[PDB]
């Protein structure tokens with residue numbers, strides 16, 4: 063099974079028995095793909111244990127997989143287990159089960175449903191400023207992801223269910239070499255999500271908007287244990303992703319103060335006298351969008367986009383056998399000098415309307431693409447921008463003595479910083 | 491997972507944890523289905539371990555699964571492992587891999603390719619008579635399956651490769667309760683077919699008609715390790731199935747002597763002076779066909795026909811969820827008094843042209859139905875009839891003191907007799 067890429071004439075690192083190429087993950091997914099992208103070029107292959115993974119970097123080939131041949135060949139991602147009842151989660155579901163869930167949950171982030179959330183979100187931002195105004199007086203370093211995650215959790219519980227609360231690898235290493243053990247753990251009720259975290263919610267969702275828009279579309283319809291599984295996906299997505307990217311954004315503004323002031327100038331221009339950010343004023347701030355896009359270029363929290371080839375195909379002149387996991391190294395593409403001038407530098411001017419057109423939307427894919435892209439892309443941009451407006455309207459951010467500069471990425475599994483992002487906060 | 495049939499309102503025996511209903515297999519598949527068919531009626535369900543199995547007995551519902559909705563919903567059988575390289579076997583392959591193999595191997599049993607085999611098969615029948623003429627003088631009991639299997643092996647090695655040779659459960663119980671262990675054994679090279687039997691052939695096929703018609707259609711084509719896997723399927727199919735049914739036929743002729751004489755009378759009528767059976771004279775003997783069909787009714791070696799439901803459907807007014815193994819109890823249907831008068835009695839007159847029309851071809855399915863039926867159905871009927879003609883032309887068969895009457899079926903896994911079939915042979 064380890065000769066599939068030698069057979070197909072596809073270059074790649076030499077795999078070891080059983081382990082495949084997993085030992086190369088010692089520097090993390092990001093550094094591995096960046097090297098592989100430089101070592102072999104447009105297309106290479108490797109083996110996650112016994113699982114062959116093909117990495118494509120051709121924009122036409124990427125557009126073919128994510129968009130053109132999604133409903134037919136590349137519908138589902140890499141299988142993930144043990145999941146239990148979470149198999150019905152939309153990010154985990156497959157084939158016709160996914161198409162039904164994606165349609166049922168797609169009217170949750172329409173342009174109208176998001177506009178109803180701006181008056182609701184506008185509450186915890188003041189809780190966010192007032193929670194940040196107390197550490198301000200304390201005159202000391204601040205952990206951003208804590209006060210951001212506390213804010214982000216307040217938004218996700220209310221935008222989907224409406225609960226108001228003031229919010230104040232070790233084992234997956236064996237999953238990839240033992241994917242045959244995944245069916246074993248599914249019959250033991252073993253779950254990668256600890257069974258006490260889910261049991262805290264296997265009744266809490268029954269113990270309770272997105273929650274409204276599910277039973278209303280239940281009345282070939284929606285179940286109830288699956289309703290809990292979608293809540294878990296949304297609750298995690300709105301918490302961790304929003305807080306993590308906001309931590310990355312405030313770090314870049316602190317280490318690049320000129321961008322922070324020019325951002326504060328536009329915020330006070332569209333919203334004078336510290337005006338409350340509305341839906342229409344958020345989409346007007348283009349420099350805010352440029353700061354958001356550039357930070358997502360340097361830190362695409364997903365790193366990779368993956369699809370399982372479900373039958374033999376010959377896309378863009380290359381045969382791909384059945385079962386191969388097609389992977390797009392998003393972190394590697396976002397830092398390729400063959401597309402980005404001085405790629406390691408934070409430059410929001412890449413996304414100005416003077417330069418936003420020299421950017422392939424199949425190289426810069428922080429939210430994926432095609433029918434399986436990030437379903438909450440428009441909410442996440444809105445939720446973060448409403449948070450950046452209300453915070454930068456009141457505070458400036460400076461690095462501290464303990465601030466990690468340059469920021470070391472987590473050499474581990476998911477895209478996070480090694481040391482938590484701490485900065486000094488000053489009141490305007 | 492054990493409440494799927496309570497949810498759907500489908501009757502069936504109460505399953506035990508983990509085991510499901512496998513403890514009911516203590517009398518064999520046949521007695522279990524016969525009781526279930528009487529206990530619940532037209533449709534029931536049970537659990538092979540954790541695998542839900544739905545048993546249908548409605549001819550329209552059976553025709554819908556085997557024929558009408560084969561290419562779409564019920565393409566593949568129950569997954570079988572560990573198989574190794576035998577996953578590419580046509581009886582084991584799935585989806586588009588199977589459709590390619592079924593088309594590539596379908597021109598092997600055409601009406602013309604079989605007609606070329608009659609002059610070749612006509613050799614070992616004389617080896618069969620001469621091997622039976624020696625025990626004749628010995629004047630003692632004879633094991634039919636030995637001299638039939640020796641004959642059947644001579645035919646299968648020459649009709650497909652042309653090699654001339656004078657040919658003179660314990661562990662699957664854990665497969666069904668541990669289907670999660672099947673992926674484990676696939677990575678250990680563990681095989682339900684002992685690796686020394688296959689290694690005896692992983693080179694013997696390379697160390698060597700059906701074999702011709704494979705490389706000629708190779709020239710999206712056919713491989714080589716897969717060529718060996720198809721040889722193993724054919725070599726077993728032509729040996730065990732032919733020898734086993736021939737053992738059943740000669741037993742029924744011995745315990746019903748009037749049928750044996752009336753059969754010998756027609757053989758000498760179409761072929762006077764002990765004429766060599768040709769292709770056209772075999773299809774003329776209708777009483778020979780009636781004896782073959784009736785024995786296959788009492789002993790359908792497959793017992794069951796199974797299909798895996800690959801997506802949600804509502805066939806003939808009944809919803810069937812994704813993943814359910816749809817099973818047709820062939821042994822149970824062949825003995826249902828609601829279709830057969832005095833079902834336990836051997837009566838070839840059921841298949842006379844006066845009565846062959848009061849028989850539903852979706853109740854009597856000894857070779858399956860639809861695009862996935864027995865690919866070697868026409869060869870097996872021809873191979874057996876050429877053997878029955880040449881043997882009944884020279885010998886009569888009487889029961890012995892050690893002959894098992896009534897014949898006890900193997901209470902185990904596959905449809906065989908408990909004691910081997912032994913009879914006395916006399917020369918005409």
Ligand code: HEM
Nearest residue numbers: 152153296299300303364429430431434435436437438442
């Ligand atoms: C900065 C914030 C976020 C980023 C960068 C992000 C990024 C992504 C990416 C790259 C994918 C995979 C796309 C693909 O495979 O083609 C994805 C999928 C997904 N995202 Fe997000 N996401 C963010 C926030 C959110 C939020 C707030 C939600 C709220 C529900 C969410 C829900 C989902 C879901 C359910 C999927 C699975 C899509 C499917 O399987 O149909 N994400 N996201």
Ligand code: HEM
Nearest residue numbers: 580581724727728731792857858859862863864865866870
């Ligand atoms: C008395 C003799 C035989 C009987 C009663 C018999 C019966 C059957 C049955 C019931 C099936 C399954 C049909 C279904 O699932 O719908 C089958 C499949 C099959 N049979 Fe036979 N068979 C016999 C002899 C043979 C012979 C001589 C061959 C020679 C190659 C053969 C090759 C196959 C194959 C390859 C399949 C798998 C079909 C597929 O997956 O496409 N059989 N047979």
Ligand SMILES: O=C(NCCCc1cccnc1)[C@@H](Cc1ccccc1)SC[C@H](Cc1ccccc1)NS(=O)(=O)c1ccccc1
Nearest residue numbers: 139140142151153154294295298299303363364368436476
């Ligand atoms: O549902 C999951 N996540 C998406 C939900 C939240 C989210 C995150 C980021 C962007 N938008 C939304 C994963 C299981 C999970 C985790 C925490 C809470 C609940 C469930 S499992 C499927 C992934 C696909 C995937 C990957 C990346 C982004 C989106 C979707 N595939 S993955 O390779 O195994 C993997 C490995 C390590 C971390 C994350 C995912």
Ligand SMILES: O=C(NCCCc1cccnc1)[C@@H](Cc1ccccc1)SC[C@H](Cc1ccccc1)NS(=O)(=O)c1ccccc1
Nearest residue numbers: 567568570579581582722723726727731791792796864904
């Ligand atoms: O290829 C196999 N057999 C068919 C080949 C010969 C044959 C037999 C009868 C009729 N025509 C042809 C099985 C594996 C095998 C066995 C011996 C040698 C080589 C390979 S494995 C798929 C079966 C489907 C199936 C069942 C019954 C009849 C035809 C096809 N499915 S099964 O439920 O697991 C099972 C369980 C116990 C015994 C047999 C099969």
